[PDB]
Amino acid sequence: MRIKGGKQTRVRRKKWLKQASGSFGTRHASYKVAKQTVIQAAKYAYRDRRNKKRDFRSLWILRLNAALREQGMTYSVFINLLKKHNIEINRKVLSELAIKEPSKFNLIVQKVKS
Amino acid sequence: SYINKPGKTSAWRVMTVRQQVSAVLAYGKIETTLKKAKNTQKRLDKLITLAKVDNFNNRRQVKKWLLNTNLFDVDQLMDHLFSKVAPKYEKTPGGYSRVLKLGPRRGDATEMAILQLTD
């Protein structure tokens, strides 16, 4: 009862190598190497998915504090102004996108006056 | 190094030069490697220069620069030279022979060239 699994192994390696593409040179030509490349790429993609949300808030803090200190006030001042009175849910990204919205940031700065 | 080919030293080259000048005197045209023609041109021109005078001292001198062939002997080549070739080139100051670059050899693609002479 000889049982051959050549076709099964070939199909498995084919579907494994189908994921790997666009590598450097011959790297997307070896099954064993491409396996490690795919696994490492997946792990690093998970890491980037975990940390991009971590760094985007800091990016928006930079991009908004630029405008704030251009008006003569730190990002800390804006956070305090939001904190004590008239607490808003407007996100740091959306408040950063208000820069992309013309004639809007002035409305916020005049509104937060107290 | 230890036992190997004996090489192609300058003595072998000059012996081949004597052989080839004898051959070209016998025929008047020789096809071979260009580099050897370049070296043998000077000696051939000197022999032609010494062939104009036909003096027994000069005969003895040129005796040291011929060989034995089947077309003619050393004496036969010498007398044929001194009879007809000597007054042929008595009017030009050198440049009695011309080397023309032929096509590369089949074997090692050596640049072939033909040495020829005419009036």
Add this chain to the structure above:
Amino acid sequence: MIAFAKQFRVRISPQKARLVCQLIVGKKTADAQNILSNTPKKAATLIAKLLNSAIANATNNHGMNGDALYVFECVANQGPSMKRTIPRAKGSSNMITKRSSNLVVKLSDNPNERQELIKQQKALVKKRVEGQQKAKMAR
């Protein structure tokens, strides 16, 4: 416009013929003969006959103009090789490969058929998508 001619792997290494034919590829036929005659290579002799046979086939069998023909592309493929043994010092043996190369050439009479193959592939993918989408019509 191909007029291909094959020789089916005479003994020649690809490393030696690839560069020279790519140097000669992409030009007319007469100048190709002139430069190949002035080429001190075994590849020159091996390819002169192939070029002449290809020109003859294009003119006679294919009826091509010949005056507008040019060498379309080199394809110097992996021809089957030979394995031999050689004595080696200290009483050993070594294996050496005698390499050969599949010989085949293409000739184009037009500045195209590079994009015509693209048209053929486009028709092929269109028939593919047609076969895929008409399956959705079985509702």
Add this chain to the structure above:
Amino acid sequence: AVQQRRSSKHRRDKRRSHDALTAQALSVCQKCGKKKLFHRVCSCGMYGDLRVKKAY
């Protein structure tokens, strides 16, 4: 001394890039229809246009 790691196809091709050859020379012979390279004889029995040998 010996090679430690095997090279790559692209790297070996970049190395072999200098193995490529340049174009040859080509001159024109008028009386004998032929494009013979420069400072060479003509197969029609001549060198350049000066007849010096047999037509071979």
Add this chain to the structure above:
RNA sequence: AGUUACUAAGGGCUUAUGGUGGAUGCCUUGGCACUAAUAGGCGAUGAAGGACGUGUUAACCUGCGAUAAGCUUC
């Protein structure tokens, strides 16, 4: 003076064309295990087995044996 056209000797990515290798897929005058009946030796009248020879047919396999790739009786 400042931006990139244009550069690529060559290489890389994407796409397919052709080439080697017979991998995979399909099959089997082959091997393997058996099932049930027989049988369990040959040979000095010189065995099996080899070498040799034999053909309109060179050589191999095979058949046979100078009566020789075969005969006689039924």
Add this chain to the structure above:
RNA sequence: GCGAAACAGUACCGUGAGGGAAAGGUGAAAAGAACCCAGAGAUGGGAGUGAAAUAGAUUCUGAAACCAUAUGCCUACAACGUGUCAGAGCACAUUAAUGUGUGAUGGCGUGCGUUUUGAAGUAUGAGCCGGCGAGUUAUGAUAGCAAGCGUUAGUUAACCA
């Protein structure tokens, strides 16, 4: 699968005892590429038989590793286990979908198994690719779950139809 489907203990090796090879598939009928051209021929191209020559004797197909080839894009101030998250622009248009290819440039990032307290490791193995490649069975016991029977029942070893 017998080493041996193939003229196999043949080829071959060691003096020699002895050890010990690989390989099957045209096609339906050769119905074997007639005729012509280049070429000394081989070979190739037309041409024909043949449904088919993606069936041409390398004759069921022709995968992977490998070799080129070019569509389009990018690369010659460039310190990256070579990629990720993005992304200008370019060329396209699919199992039509925030599409695909590709990336000037920004952020981030020192392989796989291995055994050790442990390796990006200057610890070891791995060039790659394709197949193949290593916890079965015979009996007996124990444990778990289910069942049959079930308070002298269950069950046959062997043997026979």
Add this chain to the structure above:
RNA sequence: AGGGGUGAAAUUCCAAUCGAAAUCCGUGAUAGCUGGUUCUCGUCGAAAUAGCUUUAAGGCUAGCGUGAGAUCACAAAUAAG
């Protein structure tokens, strides 16, 4: 002619190899030492401590983890006294 021969002796040679040649078998000898051991997923999930050992690389028992059952608050912990 190999628990043999041979050896102006050196553990020399015995088919380029020999503290005792090669060949086939017992034998698939043995390997506390190396190396490897090929589908997916879910849940729980320690130790490198102790004793013994012709014993320290190993092996046996404990403790520990895990799974099934029961105990199920008198048991066990966490705080207060």
Add this chain to the structure above:
RNA sequence: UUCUCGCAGUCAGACAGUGGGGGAUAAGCUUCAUUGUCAAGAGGGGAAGAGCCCAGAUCAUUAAAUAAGGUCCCCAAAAUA
């Protein structure tokens, strides 16, 4: 964290703190007990660091409060006296 049952696994630990001994309160050293970590579990701070600090990760978020820790720039992150 009780008992029984089945399957185990580990003894070649290391590091940091405390109390030590030996060594020299020399050694990233040895021997110990205790408190935590890695082993067997990643992350941020710590210039990058298995055992230090904060801390215990189903997955997706271009959402918020934060811990350690930090705010001239590289590099998000404040000033007054």
Add this chain to the structure above:
RNA sequence: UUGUGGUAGACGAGCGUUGUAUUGGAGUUGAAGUCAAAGCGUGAGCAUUGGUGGAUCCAAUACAAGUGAGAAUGCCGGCAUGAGUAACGCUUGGGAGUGAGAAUCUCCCAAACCGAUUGACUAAGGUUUCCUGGACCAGGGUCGUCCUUCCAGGGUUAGUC
């Protein structure tokens, strides 16, 4: 409500392939295999389509595995790499002719080496490597028109050795 770090290790639930067996279907109006493209899946996998392809399969269920390949300094086979790199393993030229093709073929000429040798009778051995005609796929460390290479035809003769 606890939740979804985890090696060893425990436990549970499934998937893929072959064959057998029953119920089915497709198939020269194209099956499988193969390659490709821009799908579905928690994953074992399932597809869909294009074409090679030219006759086999797939779907549902139990039973049984030469059943599930990432390494074993794994077995074989193929392929690069190194790399046009060292070497070509004790050596010249000219003429004429042939040859499609001349450093390598033939003939002639020379030059050079040994000459108690690079001489010759002949043994062991090789066991036809011998000769002629034709040719040069397989080897000639390139070369080949030639070779001790291949085919065809011949060839060693004893009373005194």
